[PDB]
Design a protein around this nucleic acid. Structure first.
Ligand SMILES: Nc1nc2cc[nH]c2c(=O)[nH]1
Lengths: 381, 324
RNA sequence: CCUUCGAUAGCUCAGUUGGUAGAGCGGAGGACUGUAGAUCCUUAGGUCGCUGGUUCGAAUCCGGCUCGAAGGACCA
């Protein structure tokens, strides 16, 4: 029996939103939380110290790219992932490889596992569920990924995909050696229809895995059907185990999914402010010396102006990219903190209105899918 | 002597405000290249409170240098009516009035007079250059006092006398008469034995009450010999060049190595073995090697910070040795 | 006065050998929603210093000036 890592202290009266905490050996996470993708944030210019200064406590990584270079053996010898990026907080590893291209750009999956191609013949590495769990134990992350047939994809292709996903989940469970120290998050994949997804919920609820997740949603369907699927999945799953969501990060999307009952959420040049997402490349306000956001705690707005960044946007490309990315991550963290605070002392059904009033100002301009989701969950604008 | 912090549009290249503040040994004077302050000129024409508040660092002193030390001089482009400053602004007929407007918008603490004398990069042309440079300095001195707010700024003199060292001596003698706040050497962009002798002859006459400035010299040997000649202030474009092509500095003051080789993937030590520099504490050289193979910007940031820290420490050490 | 070179996107330069302009570096619109299959797509920004001639067509061929770098000093 996998231990329950979530404790619940606040839940919305008029909605399904929840606030809780997750305990990990390296840190404590406050759900709902947003985990920025580690590779992007690292290459965009942000150092470890700058990202940590904003208060982020969870990071994301891809095991396939670490396996490509410098190799599983070298990363295991020096205990790579922990002391490599210098990230002191919790990190979530991803299997990778199964992007939206699927079989169009990746080799066909054999019986043992999935095989990747590389420009060099000798750079390829085997990715078996036993190999995946071994390399992830080598990484030593608090949350351990499980090898899955992630799809973008209709027909029975998804049917055998979920069959092999269940088989590989069983193989990973049989091959996992430290259930207490590291947690494994299962993935639910059923394509576009709900009945086979309902069955998927059935077997992955039969298995007592310490975590749950949903995938294959973003980039293939609209937001209305997406939130409907998320809501049904959250309703089916219990409250004693964490729920993970992919393809999220937008303010409206994240707020709606928080209201549904989610817990986890996954080249700069644009900024995010309460009024919305605005590109700093714009020359319409390149002259105004006011900060991007007077109330934003990020150093970029409180110390530097829009005009200076516009002059520096490509003048020192690395500096501008770092500033923009750190400002966006700080805004995301502030939005998550504000949402959690609205959850804590029960203002969400009102505050959410103000949230749209932050961007739109009225219910007329709100997205139709968001309005439908709010009406269904029990919040009327 | 002294050093000028190389600034790419306010902050150091590949350095943000917080990251630049994290750099130790930062001098109190920031060298802004006039070659990269044109759009800043139109912006600051009505900002009306200086560029220090514009960049967020108002407490530091500002020097408005014409030539970007990375690209400091051709065989010849500079005249005594405009200067083709290699950089990010100020190419299209930057006349004397254009310079006055740019320095009124920027309001630098010390603004550099336009250079001349592209011979150093024999007599008749040398004398013509001397007279023309003196006329330009006189015109700048006359125009500097026309604005009360601009009167807070300081002119920096220039010395250019063609090929023959006698004419360079006469240029230095006649320019030192003007009450300029500094002196500049042009045509010595790096240097050889002949240019070293010319620099020594030129500096043998200039009064010691004003600083000496040189452009295009940043290599440790060239910097050392120029200091031996008597040059005080220097530029710092060498670390930018070293970091740009994916190389790390290795010379010890108390060349460069390309990390794009497979031999560095096994060593767990940082780029510097057991010292007290920033690289000895930030990460290990294997991390930078991996990030260079994957072409990650964080490798560039770390290399830039380490190179700037090492270069500033080298300047601090040589200044301490010279003073003591 | 005389001789040799030099002036092009915010700016170094390729093109300068006649096809209306590109790259590095500036800078424009948009995408950051499990990045190594390379920081990506769209694309704003050039009376090519000025004047004049040549040509179907000129940054390019040709002369000189304004401003010139470089040589003999209009004068020393
Ligand atoms: N963690 C995680 N992220 C994504 C993003 C797309 N699919 C997935 C998945 O299956 N798991």
């Amino acid at each position: 029996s996998a231990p329950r890592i979530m404790r619940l202290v606040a839940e919305c009266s008029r909605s399904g939103a929840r606030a809780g905490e997750l305990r990990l050996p390296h840190g404590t996470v406050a759900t709902p939380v947003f985990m920025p993708v580690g590779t992007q944030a690292t290459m965009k210019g942000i150092t470890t110290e700058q990202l940590d200064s904003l208060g982020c406590r969870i990071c994301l990584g891809n095991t396939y790219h670490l396996g490509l270079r410098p190799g599983p053996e070298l990363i295991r010898k020096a205990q790579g992932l922990h002391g490599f990026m210098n990230w002191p907080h919790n990190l979530l590893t991803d299997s990778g490889g199964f992007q939206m291209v699927s079989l169009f750009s990746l080799s066909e999956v054999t019986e043992e596992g999935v095989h990747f191609r590389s420009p060099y013949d000798g750079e390829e590495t085997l990715l078996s569920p036993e190999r995946s769990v071994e390399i992830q134990n080598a990484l030593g992350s608090d949350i351990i990924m499980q090898l899955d047939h992630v799809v973008s994809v209709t027909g029975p292709l998804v049917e055998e995909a979920m069959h092999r996903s269940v088989r590989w989940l069983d193989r990973c469970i049989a091959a996992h050696k430290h259930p207490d120290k590291q947690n494994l998050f299962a993935i639910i994949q059923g394509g576009l229809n709900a009945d086979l997804r309902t069955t998927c919920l059935k077997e992955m609820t039969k298995r007592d895995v310490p975590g749950f997740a949903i995938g294959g949603l973003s980039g293939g369907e609209s937001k209305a059907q997406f939130w409907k699927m998320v809501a049904l999945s959250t309703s089916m799953l219990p409250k004693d185990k964490p729920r993970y969501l992919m393809g999220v990060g937008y303010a409206t999307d994240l707020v709606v999914c928080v209201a549904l009952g989610c817990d986890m959420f996954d080249r700069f040049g644009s900024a995010l402010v309460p009024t919305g997402n605005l590109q700093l490349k714009k020359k319409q306000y390149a002259k105004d010396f006011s900060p991007i956001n007077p109330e934003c705690p990020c150093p970029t707005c409180q110390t530097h102006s829009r005009a200076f960044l516009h002059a520096l946007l490509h003048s020192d490309n690395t500096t501008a990219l770092h500033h923009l990315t750190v400002h966006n991550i700080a805004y995301q963290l502030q939005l998550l903190s504000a949402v959690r605070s609205s959850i804590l002392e029960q203002r969400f059904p009102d505050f959410v209105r103000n949230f749209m009033r932050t961007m739109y100002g009225d219910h007329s301009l709100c997205p139709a899918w968001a309005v439908e989701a709010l009406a269904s969950v029990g919040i009327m604008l | 002597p002294g050093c000028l912090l190389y600034t790419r549009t306010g902050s150091a290249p590949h350095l943000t405000h917080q990251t630049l503040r994290n750099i130790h040994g930062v001098p109190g004077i920031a060298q802004l290249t006039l070659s990269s302050l044109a759009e800043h000129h139109e912006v600051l024409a009505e900002y009306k409170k200086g560029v220090g508040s514009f960049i967020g660092m108002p407490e530091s002193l500002f020097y408005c240098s014409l030539h970007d030390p990375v690209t400091p001089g051709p065989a010849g482009y500079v005249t005594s009516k405009s200067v083709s400053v290699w950089g990010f602004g100020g190419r299209v007929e930057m006349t004397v009035s254009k310079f006055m407007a740019i320095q009124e918008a920027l309001q630098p603490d010390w603004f550099q007079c336009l250079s001349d004398g592209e011979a150093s990069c024999s007599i008749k042309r040398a004398r013509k250059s001397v007279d023309r440079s003196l006329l330009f300095l006189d015109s700048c001195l006359r125009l500097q006092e026309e604005s009360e707010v601009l009167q807070k700024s300081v002119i920096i003199g220039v010395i250019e006398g063609g090929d023959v060292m006698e004419e360079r001596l006469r240029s230095a003698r006649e320019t030192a008469k003007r009450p300029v706040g500094g002196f500049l050497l042009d045509g010595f962009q790096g240097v050889t034995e002949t240019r070293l002798h010319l620099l020594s002859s030129v500096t043998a006459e200039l009064p010691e009450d004003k600083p000496r400035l040189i452009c295009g010299v940043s290599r440790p040997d060239e910097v050392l010999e120029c200091i031996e000649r008597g040059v005080d202030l220097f530029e710092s474009f060498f670390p930018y060049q070293v970091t740009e092509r994916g190389c790390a500095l290795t010379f010890t003051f108390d060349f460069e190595i390309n990390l794009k080789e497979k031999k560095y993937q096994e060593d767990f030590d940082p780029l510097v073995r057991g010292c007290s520099c920033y690289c000895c504490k930030n990460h290990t050289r294997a991390y930078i090697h991996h990030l260079l193979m994957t072409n990650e910007l964080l490798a560039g940031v770390l290399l830039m910070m380490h190179n700037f820290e090492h270069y500033f420490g080298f300047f601090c050490s040589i200044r301490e040795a010279l003073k003591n």
